[PDB]
Design a protein around this ligand. Structure first.
Ligand code: HEM
Ligand code: OVP
Ligand code: CL
Length: 393
């Protein structure tokens, strides 16, 4: 009853252009079987949203990558939040929620916005820039390591470590095995910056450690929660901001609307998150036999959720392949959905909003003026290089 497909969603041809294969996955049925990796797949909005919102049946503690932690040993100690289920997940989640809270956003907003304006002013002096290295990477690098409380030395480890983490959710293909081969120095640096004495006062990392006396987490759980923010909080925003700039470069009519009302900045970034879905895929593991969209799935089976595909499902979205900065984006799954929904989404949205605000106020045109090169990752979608000329307003 379940269609079997040979599509490899972790192949370079897939990453290069996922959208035809994603339609094939959606239209084959609500539940498909991917023979290449022996996993179930769900690519429509309805099933993806259903799976995300039943964490009991579709658990995360057996891993949210291809690997099943009941069968193989995790490549690194499990995340206490991403790779945990309720109730063990609940109190670490609460702590990160309060650390990455509206009050914390109020403390950092003015500084995040100054750096966004400063960066755009600096790029406008160069004219022709790489919107990845010089913007999508440079701007988060200028705010997020400092907001964490990290020392200056060794920050060049951060993006390689995150790329490794996201590649490691994938199958044991060359992307994943090469990433792990090169992992030793990046893991060393990261695990070391997770210790309380190495995190500057007032930052996110020192705040997690300062939350270790409330009965929610113990001191030995704080380094791994810092590790969560160093894994999940930089590379995602790089690809989210890169997606937004790529969208404005490809849809000049939407840049013109954004310029005329810079208060659309926050929704323009949210739409970019839906439209490109920087985090493309995640797995769950079934804890029991379950019926999903007419399909019987046995216990202990991996289920691949196509988040990017669900965000382009025409069953849920009108004109899903159009970038529309006034779209009602509520309900997109680019940040997930349910008990694991991105606990850092306020940081991501703050960064994306203030950057698109700076572009809206200072830039008249964004024109691609060089070869676009895609960056390949088993989990993240984004560009390696995006050459653009910025015309000042
Ligand atoms: C555009 C940027 C971002 C995107 C697209 C994104 C995406 C996601 C997604 C899809 C999930 C759900 C994972 C799952 O359901 O298994 C998630 C969870 C999470 N995100 Fe984000 N994220 C972004 C930015 C950030 C930032 C800035 C931080 C930290 C400062 C962060 C930290 C986390 C953490 C710790 C989790 C685990 C939450 C949990 O399991 O309860 N993310 N993110
Ligand atoms: C998409 S959320 C995420 C991604 C990578 C790592 C972690 C973590 O908690 O270590 C979380
Ligand atoms: Cl690690």
């Amino acid at each position: 009853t379940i269609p079997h497909l040979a599509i490899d969603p972790f192949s370079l041809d897939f990453f290069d252009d996922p959208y035809p294969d994603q339609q094939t996955l959606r239209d084959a049925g609500p539940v498909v079987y991917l023979d290449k990796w022996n996993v179930y797949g769900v690519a429509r909005y309805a099933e993806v949203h259903a799976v995300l919102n039943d964490p009991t049946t579709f658990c995360s503690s057996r891993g949210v990558g291809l690997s099943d932690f009941k069968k193989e040993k995790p490549w690194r100690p499990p995340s206490l939040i991403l790779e945990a289920d309720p109730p063990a997940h609940t109190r670490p989640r609460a702590v990160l929620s309060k650390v990455l809270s509206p009050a914390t956003m109020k403390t950092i907003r003015d500084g995040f916005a100054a750096a966004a304006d400063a960066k755009v002013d600096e790029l406008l002096q160069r004219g022709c820039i790489d919107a990845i290295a010089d913007l999508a990477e440079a701007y988060p690098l200028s705010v997020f390591p400092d907001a964490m409380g990290l020392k200056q030395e060794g920050r060049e480890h951060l993006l390689p470590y995150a790329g490794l983490v996201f590649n490691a959710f994938g199958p044991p293909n060359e992307l994943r095995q090469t990433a792990i081969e090169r992992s030793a120095p990046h893991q060393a640096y990261v695990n070391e910056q997770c210790q309380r004495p190495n995190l500057a006062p007032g930052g996110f990392g020192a705040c997690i450690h300062a939350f270790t006396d409330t009965g929610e987490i113990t001191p030995d759980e704080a380094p791994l929660l810092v590790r969560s923010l160093l894994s999940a909080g930089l590379d995602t925003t790089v690809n989210g901001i890169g997606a937004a700039v790529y969208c404005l470069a490809r849809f000049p009519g939407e840049l013109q609307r954004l310029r005329s009302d810079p208060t659309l900045a926050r929704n323009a970034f949210e739409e970019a998150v839906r439209f490109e879905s920087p985090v493309q895929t995640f797995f769950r593991t079934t804890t029991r036999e379950v019926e999903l969209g007419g399909a019987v799935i046995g216990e202990g089976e991996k289920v691949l959720m196509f988040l990017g595909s669900a965000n382009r499902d025409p069953r849920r979205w009108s004109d899903p392949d159009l970038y529309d900065i006034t779209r009602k984006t509520s309900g997109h799954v680019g940040f997930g959905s349910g008990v694991h929904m991105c606990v850092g989404q306020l940081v991501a949205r703050l960064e994306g909003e203030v950057m698109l605000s700076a572009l809206a106020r200072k830039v008249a045109a964004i024109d691609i003026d060089g070869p676009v090169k895609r960056r390949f990752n088993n989990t993240l979608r984004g560009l390696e290089s995006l050459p653009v000329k910025l015309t000042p307003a």
